[PDB]
Design a protein around this ligand. Structure first.
Ligand SMILES: CN(CCCNC(=O)Nc1ccc(C(C)(C)C)cc1)C[C@H]1O[C@@H](n2cnc3c(N)ncnc32)[C@H](O)[C@@H]1O
Length: 319
């Protein structure tokens, strides 16, 4: 006993057992099915027309099977329309944000079956989707860039960014054995679903490793965009990263939850070896409604490597 959904681009259908599993208090497979059908109507305007007719009894097998069947047969109809003069769906484009959010929800739920082994507090960043999205809007990125998430967890922020941007490569690095294991599954599931919807992504890799290691020094030195959720790192790790940041090329960016250099920073003669000297540090606007683990309106920081701040001080003395 089963329900199946045909891929709009000929990939292996998606197959769900019945009764349909529940994922957590707020997500189940019924609604995964309903949403998936609606995003595919958004990809294909003709399907929207044919499907025009749709609430459903998610508990009733045959009320669900009707919806599936009506969806599968309209897909057949559509592939037939592409055999004619009509042109196939613009293939290897990138997913809209709405769709990406659905996809990453799907991938997670198919990959992290026991979310109980991920322990009370927010240290892995579960609903940071919108946040990363805002960040992706502000920090323009081009095919010249390299991106790294430092302490990449199960991998969701690497996948979101690789999907959204066109950097020449996207890296994630994780130290702990459990999430690196989950990240292997996440990577699989993501590739499969992205094919299923017929959507393109940038190159990305999910590695195992310590970002404080010797190999990672010059790796960090050559990365142009670094995302780092450093809220729970503690003072010693911050200090080590600061060192590694000193070797970064000009223009390099660092976006974080805690600042690595003060906002009010005027160079004087007692602070000459501070990282402050080599970087611009702004505070970014948070999203109305998001809160930190301290029940607190959040705040985030953009650091740009700009050495001309220093050059200027070695002229204010030649004055
Ligand atoms: C932060 N990270 C998991 C969160 C998943 N990724 C994010 O949240 N990225 C992210 C999210 C939001 C933002 C912004 C844009 C600031 C909002 C920027 C980045 C913690 C992981 O770091 C791992 N970790 C600890 N120290 C480690 C070490 N030295 N080397 C390897 N990994 C280590 C630790 O095991 C844990 O899995």
């Amino acid at each position: 006993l089963e329900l199946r959904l045909k891929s709009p681009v000929g990939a292996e259908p998606a197959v769900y057992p019945w009764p349909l599993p529940v994922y957590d208090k707020h997500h189940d497979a019924a609604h995964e099915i309903i949403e998936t059908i609606r995003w595919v109507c958004e990809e294909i305007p003709d399907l929207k027309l044919a499907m025009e007719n749709y609430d459903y009894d998610t508990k009733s097998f045959e009320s669900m099977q009707r919806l599936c069947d009506k969806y599968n047969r309209a897909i057949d109809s559509i592939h037939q329309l592409w055999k004619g003069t009509t042109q196939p769906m613009k293939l290897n484009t990138r997913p809209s944000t709405g769709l990406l959010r659905h996809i990453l929800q799907q991938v997670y739920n198919h990959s992290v079956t026991d979310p109980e082994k991920l322990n009370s507090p927010e240290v892995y960043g579960e609903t940071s989707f919108d946040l990363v999205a805002q960040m992706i809007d502000e920090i323009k990125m081009t095919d010249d860039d390299l991106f790294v998430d430092l302490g990449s967890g199960v991998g969701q922020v690497v996948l979101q960014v690789a999907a959204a941007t066109n950097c020449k490569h996207h890296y994630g690095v994780e130290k702990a054995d459990i999430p690196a294991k989950y990240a292997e599954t996440m990577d699989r599931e993501f590739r499969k679903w992205m094919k299923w919807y017929g959507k393109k992504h940038a190159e990305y890799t999910l590695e195992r490793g310590d970002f404080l290691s010797e190999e990672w020094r010059e790796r960090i030195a050559n990365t142009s965009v670094i995302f780092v959720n450093n809220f729970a790192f503690g003072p010693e790790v911050d200090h080590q990263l600061k060192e590694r940041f000193a070797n970064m090329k000009e223009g390099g960016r660092i976006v974080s939850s805690k600042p690595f250099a003060p906002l009010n920073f005027r160079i004087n003669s007692r602070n000459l070896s501070d990282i402050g000297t080599i970087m611009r540090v702004v505070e970014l606007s948070p999203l109305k409604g998001s809160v930190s683990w301290t029940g607190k309106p959040v705040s985030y920081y953009l650091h740009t490597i700009d050495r001309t701040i220093l050059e200027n001080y070695f002229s204010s003395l030649k004055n």
